[PDB]
Amino acid sequence: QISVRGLAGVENVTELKKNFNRHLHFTLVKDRNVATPRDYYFALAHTVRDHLVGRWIRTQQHYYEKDPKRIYYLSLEFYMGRTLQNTMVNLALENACDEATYQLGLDMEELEEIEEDAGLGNGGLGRLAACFLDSMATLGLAAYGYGIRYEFGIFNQKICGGWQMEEADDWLRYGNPWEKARPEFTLPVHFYGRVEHTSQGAKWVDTQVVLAMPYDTPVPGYRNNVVNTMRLWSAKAPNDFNLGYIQAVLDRNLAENISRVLYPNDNFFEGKELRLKQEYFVVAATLQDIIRRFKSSNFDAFPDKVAIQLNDTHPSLAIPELMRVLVDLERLDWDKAWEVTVKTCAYTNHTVLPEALERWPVHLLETLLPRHLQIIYEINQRFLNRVAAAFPGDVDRLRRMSLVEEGAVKRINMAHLCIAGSHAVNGVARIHSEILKKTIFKDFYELEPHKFQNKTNGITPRRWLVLCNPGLAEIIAERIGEEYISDLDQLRKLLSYVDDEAFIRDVAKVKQENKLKFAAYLEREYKVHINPNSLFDVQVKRIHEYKRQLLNCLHVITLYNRIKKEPNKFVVPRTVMIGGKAAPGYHMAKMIIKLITAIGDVVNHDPVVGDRLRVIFLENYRVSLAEKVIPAADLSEQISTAGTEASGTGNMKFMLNGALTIGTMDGANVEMAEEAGEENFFIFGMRVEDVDRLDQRGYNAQEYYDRIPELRQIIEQLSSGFFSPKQPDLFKDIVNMLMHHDRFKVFADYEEYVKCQERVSALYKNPREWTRMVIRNIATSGKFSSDRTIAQYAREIWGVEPSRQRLPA
Amino acid sequence: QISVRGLAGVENVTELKKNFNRHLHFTLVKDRNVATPRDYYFALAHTVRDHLVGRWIRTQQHYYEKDPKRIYYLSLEFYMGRTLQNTMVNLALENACDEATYQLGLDMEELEEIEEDAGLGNGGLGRLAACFLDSMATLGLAAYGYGIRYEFGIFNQKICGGWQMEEADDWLRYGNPWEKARPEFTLPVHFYGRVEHTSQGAKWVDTQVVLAMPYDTPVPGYRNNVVNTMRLWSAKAPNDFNLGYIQAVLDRNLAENISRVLYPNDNFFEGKELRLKQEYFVVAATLQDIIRRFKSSNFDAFPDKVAIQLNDTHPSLAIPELMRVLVDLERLDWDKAWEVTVKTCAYTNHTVLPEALERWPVHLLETLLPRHLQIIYEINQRFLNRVAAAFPGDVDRLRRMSLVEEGAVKRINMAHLCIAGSHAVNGVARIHSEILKKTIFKDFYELEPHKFQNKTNGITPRRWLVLCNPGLAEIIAERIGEEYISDLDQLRKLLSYVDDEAFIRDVAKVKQENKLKFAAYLEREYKVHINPNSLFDVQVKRIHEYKRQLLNCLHVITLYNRIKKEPNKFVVPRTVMIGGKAAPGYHMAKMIIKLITAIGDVVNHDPVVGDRLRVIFLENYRVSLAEKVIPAADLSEQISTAGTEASGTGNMKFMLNGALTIGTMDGANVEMAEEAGEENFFIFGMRVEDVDRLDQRGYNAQEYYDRIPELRQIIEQLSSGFFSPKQPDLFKDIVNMLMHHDRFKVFADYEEYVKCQERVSALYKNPREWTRMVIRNIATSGKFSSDRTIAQYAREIWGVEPSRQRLPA
Ligand SMILES: O=c1cc(-c2ccc(F)cc2)oc2cc(O)cc(O)c12
Ligand SMILES: O=c1cc(-c2ccc(F)cc2)oc2cc(O)cc(O)c12
């Protein structure tokens, strides 16, 4: 059909069809008379998996022969989404499979929809890991993703009576054809026990053993024939475990609970034992595997052969674990073991919000990991000795920098552990990296300025353009070729097309087609009727106070009130779509979801409004829904309070896909506006400096309420029960937070947000100028490719050279 | 190599090799450089599975088209063992695979050893189910095995310090290539709740739902291209289940515990709730599936299209369940629903031992299955009304026959439910069936004499001859052809060879080869050194008081004492091998294992004994060990107290494989001796009538102890600590039971057992006459083919005609 989807050759097609029918018969044990669409999906998945195998075997082979430095990306989260379409894209099989399936009388797009998302992450951090794996494969790095194969990923979200309800995400019920179990590489992980000191060193004894069984998933690079590995551990009980009889067998569950379920908190730390178990489990199994590989190539060369990247502090125990192995098992002296550890490990920080910081109570570590605690204290002592020598007399510095926090309960600051034990610490956007150096890690920065770097986040243009937006991919490719898909900076060439009538027509056409398709998807799957001619105003991301969905709610209510005041006046019609999950125990986040739906109930059913204003809560926001809605968006809402959103990646996805951004100077928004030019971005609100000025004098929300009549009216509607006539006090908690306890200064930005929203509507009245600005955005979106990010990691942290050379087929 | 293993054609072999290499690459994702023997096993398993698929699809297809009466064998146990070799045998692929693997440089026999047993049963009952599936497929019956896919089968048995230790049988760790998950046929099963009565009948409401997900395993018939289905249910939680968050997900375990583990009791009832859950779970899912199939062909024709065979009372709830569906859901009147139920259901009884009888407390049924209880009471009332009309005034009869037993706790007699709700009740050997009519079911028999039948047990000559003893299979086939493998009566033709010098030579040679192979297997796997020239005296079966392993121990100790008395006298050398599992909570059974090993410690280490007497406990007796040891045996020990062993099947396996039997007139032993002639069997001990005479006057063990000096010496050795020098009182419980509380009258049979054992040794001194008697045994073993058994079931219970006609390939 379209060119970027590749060739459908006669041979190729015939072959895919034969293999499809072979899998249906032999793999699925079905004839064409009893097969369901699910069987068909499975037959196709196996057929495509077949094309990976040789490449996967050869790539792993090639790494053994060449022995390059290996990158180990340790994450508790990999937010992969669906694998089928991504695999086809990367193997150039898409058109061939479309053709092959078509000829069997099947719609490939209908089959694609049957695949469960691998929702093994919460949000930005987990998706960053996924984009990274794609880029690392595309850049020919010998890189391995290591995590946990959770039986249950992020919960499926249902709305009932406007409230979020959580359901178990049983993504493995029907089987996963993409993974290969490797039981022969099963490893023991130890817990509990106690430490004996002997003649020749400390001994960790009387432990409980859980086994870690690995599952490997192929990670194909873009058309280079590279297939890297994602290795995820599953917990299994040993067979002597517990071993009246029945109960002992049933108690095997206790041990396997470790890999059972993803904790569904985004930027929130919950200090539960099961969570620490997961953190140690992935670290212990991963490090044994790393060391085993290494010895099949003296520890002096370890950092020349191994890089370990820590995705947040979740795998911070890799630092004490590597020490434990080097010192207790391999019998290296402390100082050498330490040198090796620091040169191997690097730490990526993802947020400055205090409630996200991992601070583990000591009593927990004491019981579960007694040896690791001793090692942590030893690290703390030696670290503080270095600090005291550098800053003699500065006792306050000593307590601020300690890995151990005194207080009610003593805790370990895992972020402090990470900085101490890493040769590099990076934030995830320039402004975030600056804030790390100015504020929370200032002391660490003054001690070791060389450790601190920036690596601005990115997204893969494979999933986030070619895959989800083939029509845009194609019109770009018509003008400038296909090379940009693995070299996104090439999009700058689109700037010479900003005054091309045909290209303007194409850009707008693709946007319109995307909106029609999405509007249809809404009606089919969720019986809702949206005007496709309206401006699509979308905020999709986890529900959070800092992300300020509430600010969007205030704008929505304002438009509503303006319409009612003057019903017979023109306004640019909008569909406001808001979507995301709240963490199950985050009450405020759950109230915001309810507020959103309650506004919809009023707005969507008002006859005077008509199709001028629609408010839709998009249920079950996940990767596969992002792929649908992001291409359909006109306006991206990126409206976190300045200094709170470390980077964001949603922002970049929308820039790439032809939406304009309304946002604060926060996270990568600053770099996006810099790349596109401020005149091509809808910037509003306090800067970082403004927020600090307001904090110095104190944030009084009442001042805003007293001075802005439009705002007062909204707060009164909320309070009086305009939005909740049966429970008039439903939203008392919300009004109250906004008036008395708003950490995120919603009111402070309200006035500038509304004015800036008026400028958006004004530009939308002028399609040509809208589209011209869109082009300026897409054309400058190159920096935000994860290819750029990973090449920066490779060169400035890992000490490896990326490559775009094909392995042989 | 050998003829019964089939042709290895050039095409066949080439083809298997291609498919083997295809699976290694594509299925297992391995090159020949990294593959382990386990990978090789898996590649072969997939390759053989491929040959089943078309046949499986066509057979299921054929049953839909022809719509024959369907047989549903409901068992909580299917003791399948390994599948690979059995599949090859039934598809005639064995030599071809041997050749194909050989050419790849692999030993097929080494690969076969890597397969886990599917140990989804305890002993006789579970193995009977497996043999039946084989026969039903071989006789072209449209038959389905229905059970539970336990995650853990019968525990792996280790001996430590002579004691049994249990380990979890994690048979699914590496995957099962033989099963196909069918998630699309998932069904709800309900538990708990309460009953509302309405205008239109009773309604079971507020239930908890567990899902039943089926896994299908192919059951190939012998060379007829028939492949039937074994469908096993796995328990899965619904996704709204429990749905703070984490705990709700972790609690999904509660529901899935149902299919987690096989209860390891043989002929023992344990009234645990989890066990009742399993019983209902398999019944509820099975019946929905049966009815669904039926409606895709009015309930008047149900029994013309459906037979349900109940393997013991374990699935007795099928009777109230079928009523519940017919009455509550389908709205049939009681009497019609009942007629349908009786005409559909048939009950096989497996034992008369009182501790095996399922008697479920009412409070348990009340809570878990309140509707089923009401239906059971309704059945009871109507049944007792029929009894009162037939036997007016006989109040005692009424209480004896009640389905409900009064007492401490009220209980339901599930066996009574089965007789009431079945058109046929069979025992499992002639003498057992007679005892059912004379004793425990006399009342039921007097009411409905037409219900009571015999169906003498059998074993499949595929697994139990061709597969485990190819060398015997071959020399038989040399004289009489291959037809006997599916028509075992043909073995009678061997009687014309009883005076053939060559055939005598062959029989003895094969026995000798089997003993060499087994003796080697002992050294390799368990570092033990046995004289292959000795008589192999084997007792393999579950450890039980009724099976009288202790009687064997007494004989062993007697030979020991005789040798010591007169060291310099000739005795026929013996290896006594005893093996089997004790139920984990059966203290006595566990003490017997320890006694066995303690005798070995004394006997095997006595220099004066030499290699004249060896005592070996065979660890982890299971199906795949039976396949090795049974062909190697000279003497089969079948020595249960008369009237206790309903049938036995071990007895038949050994008769088929060239061992002579020493046994009591118990179970099928009576029919075996009748088939072979008593002169060709070593019969000893009390008959049934003798046991009854002894019970009438009282069993005084002391009388035996006082009159038999040889016996007194043994009891004194036991007591004084001859066998346990460090714990002198170790065996106090055993001496005590033997002296004061022996239900099984070990002493009563001791004297006759020893004399009869002397006759065995005497015949063994004469190889030619030994072998001639062996031939008379093999030659008359035809009746004990499960083909005979199933043809009897088909004709006299199910109302279907067996067939030996090939389906097209
Ligand atoms: O997931 C959560 C996130 C947040 C949060 C608040 C404010 C920030 F700035 C950042 C995160 O708070 C919580 C409070 C709870 O009691 C339970 C929760 O699950 C959360
Ligand atoms: O598995 C068992 C079998 C028997 C048994 C005894 C005598 C017979 F005649 C038959 C069976 O007794 C038991 C007693 C227990 O306390 C626990 C057990 O697990 C068992």
The tokens describing A721, both together, are 């029960």
Question: Which of B56, B167, B252 has its CB closest to that of A240?
Answer: B167
Distance from C-alpha of A735 to C-alpha of B531, rounded to nearest angstrom: 91
B54: nearest CA partner in chain A:
A25
Provide the 8-state DSSP code for B496: G
Task: Identify any residues that bridge with A229 across adjacent strands, giving them in sequence order.
Answer: A144, A218
DSSP per-residue codes, A156-199? EEEEETTEEEEE---TTTT--TT-EE-GGG-EEEEEEEEEEEET
Q: Look at B253 and A253 and tell me if their CB atoms are within 8 Å.
A: yes
Instruction: Find all residues with CB under 8 Å of A33, minimum gap 6, and list them.
Output: none
Residues A475 and A432 in one domain: no
Strands B535-540 and B635-638: parallel
Alpha helices in B682-731 (DSSP H): 688-697, 701-707, 709-720
Q: B216: which chain A residues are within 8 Å (Cβ-Cβ)? A: 29
Pick the closest to residue B269 from B415, B81, B169 (CA basis): B415
Pick the closest to residue A644 from A589, A687, A582 (CA basis): A687
Q: What is the dihedral of CA B38, B43, B48, B51, to 10 degrees?
A: 160
Q: At what angle do helices A10-22 and A37-66 cross, to 10 degrees?
A: 110
Q: Rg of chain B over CA atoms, in angstroms?
A: 27
Distance from C-alpha of A613 to C-alpha of A398, rounded to nearest angstrom: 57
What's the maximum distance between 2 C-alpha atoms anywhere in chain A? 90
Backbone angles phi, psi at B393, to 5 degrees: 95, -15
Distance from C-alpha of A567 to C-alpha of A587, rounded to nearest angstrom: 36
Backbone angles phi, psi at A588, to 5 degrees: -60, -45
Instruction: Find all residues with CB under 8 Å of A241, minimum gap 6, and list them.
Output: A209, A248, A251, A252, A255, B168
Distance from C-alpha of B398 to C-alpha of B444, rounded to nearest angstrom: 11
Instruction: Find all residues with CB under 8 Å of B252, minimum gap 6, and list them.
Output: A168, B237, B241, B242
Q: Are A638 and A661 in contact (CB under 8 A)?
A: yes
Q: What is the 3-state secondary structure (H, E, C) of A479-543?
A: HHCCHHHHCHHHHHHHHHHCCCHHHHHHHHHHHHHHHHHHHHHHHHHHCCCCCCCCEEEEEECCC
Residues B447 and B512 in one domain: no
Strands A156-160 and A78-81: unpaired
Residues A56 and A103 in one domain: yes
* CA triple A469-A473-A479, angle to 5 deg: 155
Mutate to test the pocket of ligand 2, among B125, B355, B590 (most ligand atoms within 8 A of CB): B355
Q: Are B379 and B417 in contact (CB under 8 A)?
A: yes
Distance from C-alpha of B28 to C-alpha of A203, rounded to nearest angstrom: 39
Pick the closest to residue B552 from B539, B540, B534 (CA basis): B539
Length of chain B as a residue count: 809
Residues A307 and A433 in one domain: yes
Three-state DSSP class for B575? strand
Q: Which of B51, B277, B371, B542 is catalytic?
A: B542
**Which H or E run contains B618?**
strand B613-618
Distance from C-alpha of B279 to C-alpha of B233, rounded to nearest angstrom: 12
Backbone angles phi, psi at B168, to 5 degrees: -60, 135
Distance from C-alpha of B256 to C-alpha of B151, rounded to nearest angstrom: 10
Three-state DSSP class for B474? helix
Location of structure tokens 């149902």: B258
Distance from C-alpha of A284 to C-alpha of A322, rounded to nearest angstrom: 9
Q: Look at B261 and A239 and tell me if their CB atoms are within 8 Å.
A: no
Give the Cβ contact number of residue B697 at 10 Å.
7
Distance from CA of B330 to the nearest CA of A (A): 27
Three-state DSSP class for A271? coil
Determination technique used: X-ray
Q: What is the 3-state secondary structure (H, E, C) of A472-496?
A: HHHHHHHHHCCHHHHCHHHHHHHHH
Residues A499 and A451 in one domain: no
Q: What is the dihedral of CA A438, A444, A450, A456, to 10 degrees?
A: -50
Q: Are B449 and B425 in contact (CB under 8 A)?
A: no
Three-state DSSP class for A74? strand
Residue type, B398: L
CA distances from A581 to A264, A540, A744, B231, B274 (A): 9, 9, 19, 40, 37
Residue A393 domain boundaries:
1-458+786-809
Backbone angles phi, psi at A359, to 5 degrees: -125, 95
Residues A247 and A305 in one domain: yes
Residues B794 and B773 in one domain: no
Three-state DSSP class for A117? coil
Annotated binding site of B: 31, 64, 292-297
Provide the 8-state DSSP code for B529: -
**Which H or E run contains A311?**
strand A306-311
Three-state DSSP class for B187? strand
Q: Residue A272 C-alpha to ligand 1 middle, in angstroms?
A: 15
Q: Are B372 and B317 in contact (CB under 8 A)?
A: yes
What's the sign of the alpha-carbon dihedral A323, A329, A330, A331? Answer: positive
Q: Scan residues 239-258 of B and list those with Cβ closer than 8 Å to A.
A: 239-241, 243-246, 248-250, 252-253, 257
Pick the closest to residue A77 from A115, A133, A127, A131 (CA basis): A127
DSSP 3-state percent helix, strand, coil across chain A (nearest 5): 55, 15, 30
Distance from C-alpha of B148 to C-alpha of B247, rounded to nearest angstrom: 27
Distance from C-alpha of B115 to C-alpha of B131, rounded to nearest angstrom: 19
Backbone angles phi, psi at A512, to 5 degrees: -60, -40
Residues A124 and A44 in one domain: yes
The tokens describing A174, both together, are 């029907």
Three-state DSSP class for B362? helix
Q: Are B627 and B463 in contact (CB under 8 A)?
A: yes
Residues A219 and A257 in one domain: yes
Q: Are B452 and B433 in contact (CB under 8 A)?
A: yes
CA distances from B657 to B127, B636, B652 (A): 17, 10, 9
Distance from C-alpha of A747 to C-alpha of A750, rounded to nearest angstrom: 5
Whether B277 is a known active-site residue: answer no
The tokens describing B683, both together, are 């019969």
Q: Residue A751 C-alpha to ligand 2 middle, in angstroms?
A: 81
Q: Are B451 and B419 in contact (CB under 8 A)?
A: yes
Q: What is the dihedral of CA B298, B299, B305, B306, to 10 degrees?
A: 170
Location of structure tokens 């209880």: B373
Length of chain A as a residue count: 809
Task: Extract the runs of DSSP E, i.e. beta strands, from A353-445.
Answer: 359-361, 404-405, 411-413, 424-427
Backbone angles phi, psi at A428, to 5 degrees: -130, 10
Distance from C-alpha of B349 to C-alpha of B313, rounded to nearest angstrom: 8
Three-state DSSP class for A146? strand
Label residues A7-29 b or e (16+ Cβ within 10 Å = b): ebeeebbeebbebbeebbbbbbb
Whether B542 is a known active-site residue: answer yes
CA distances from B283 to A64, A154, B84, B279 (A): 54, 35, 29, 6
Alpha helices in A188-272 (DSSP H): 245-250, 252-256
Distance from C-alpha of A569 to C-alpha of B409, rounded to nearest angstrom: 81
The tokens describing A422, both together, are 């890493």
Q: Are A166 and A155 in contact (CB under 8 A)?
A: yes
Q: Look at B30 and A57 and tell me if their CB atoms are within 8 Å.
A: yes
Backbone angles phi, psi at A360, to 5 degrees: -85, 125
Residue type, A400: R
Residues B238 and B294 in one domain: yes
Looking at the structure of chain A, the number of domains it has is: 2
**Which H or E run contains B576?**
strand B574-579
Last residue before each gap in chain A (C to N over 2.5 A): 243, 297
Pick the closest to residue B370 from B192, B205, B209 (CA basis): B192
The tokens describing A529, both together, are 């009727």
Task: Identify any residues that bridge with B309 across adjacent strands, giving them in sequence order.
Answer: B73, B346
DSSP per-residue codes, A655-724? HHTT-EEEE-S-TTHHHHHHHH-GGGSEE-S--HHHHHHHHHH---HHHHHHH-HHHHHHHHHHHHTTT-
**Which H or E run contains B15?**
helix B10-22
Residues A718 and A802 in one domain: no
Pocket of ligand 2 (CB under 6 A): B 265, 267-268, 353, 355, 545-546, 583, 585-586
Three-state DSSP class for B408? coil
Give the distance, in angstroms, between the CA of residue B508 and the centroid of all CA atoms in the same chain.
29
Three-state DSSP class for A109? helix
Task: Extract the runs of DSSP E, i.e. beta strands, from B179-337.
Answer: 180-181, 187-198, 201-220, 227-236, 306-311
Q: Are B325 and B396 in contact (CB under 8 A)?
A: no
Give the Cβ contact number of residue A692 at 10 Å.
13
What's the maximum distance between 2 C-alpha atoms anywhere in chain B? 90
Q: Which ligand is nearest to the CA of B584?
A: 2
Query: What strand order describes the sheet that includes B574-579?
Result: B613-618, B574-579, B535-540, B635-638, B660-663, B682-683
Distance from C-alpha of A394 to C-alpha of A413, rounded to nearest angstrom: 20
Pick the closest to residue A127 from A91, A173, A81, A84 (CA basis): A81
Three-state DSSP class for A41? helix
Q: Look at B584 and A252 and tell me if their CB atoms are within 8 Å.
A: no
Q: What is the dihedral of CA A753, A759, A764, A769, to 10 degrees?
A: -130
Location of structure tokens 């300045």: A642
Task: Extract the runs of DSSP E, i.e. beta strands, from B633-691.
Answer: 635-638, 660-663, 682-683
Three-state DSSP class for A606? coil
Distance from C-alpha of B118 to C-alpha of B129, rounded to nearest angstrom: 13
Alpha helices in B468-579 (DSSP H): 470-480, 501-526, 549-565
How far apart are the two ends of chain B, measured CA to CA in Å? 25
Backbone angles phi, psi at B517, to 5 degrees: -60, -45
Task: Identify any residues that bridge with A165 across adjacent strands, giving them in sequence order.
Answer: A158
Distance from C-alpha of A576 to C-alpha of A447, rounded to nearest angstrom: 48
Residue type, A590: K
* Ligand 1 within 6 A of CB of A351: no
Task: Identify any residues that bridge with B120 across adjacent strands, giving them in sequence order.
Answer: B78
Give the Cβ contact number of residue B795 at 10 Å.
12
Give the Cβ contact number of residue B408 at 10 Å.
7
Distance from C-alpha of A657 to C-alpha of B17, rounded to nearest angstrom: 51
Location of structure tokens 């039903």: B136
Last residue before each gap in chain B (C to N over 2.5 A): 243, 297
The tokens describing A484, both together, are 């940009």
Distance from C-alpha of B633 to C-alpha of B651, rounded to nearest angstrom: 12
Backbone angles phi, psi at B743, to 5 degrees: -65, -20
Burial of A51 (0-12, 13-18, 19+ CB in 10 A): buried
Distance from C-alpha of A404 to C-alpha of A373, rounded to nearest angstrom: 10
The tokens describing A325, both together, are 């192995």
Distance from C-alpha of A803 to C-alpha of A788, rounded to nearest angstrom: 12
Q: Are B219 and B228 in contact (CB under 8 A)?
A: yes
**Resolution at which this structure was determined, Å:** 2.3
Q: List the CATH number of the domain containing B340.
A: 3.40.50.2000
Instruction: Find all residues with CB under 8 Å of A509, minimum gap 6, and list them.
Output: none
Residues A393 and A519 in one domain: no
Three-state DSSP class for A208? strand
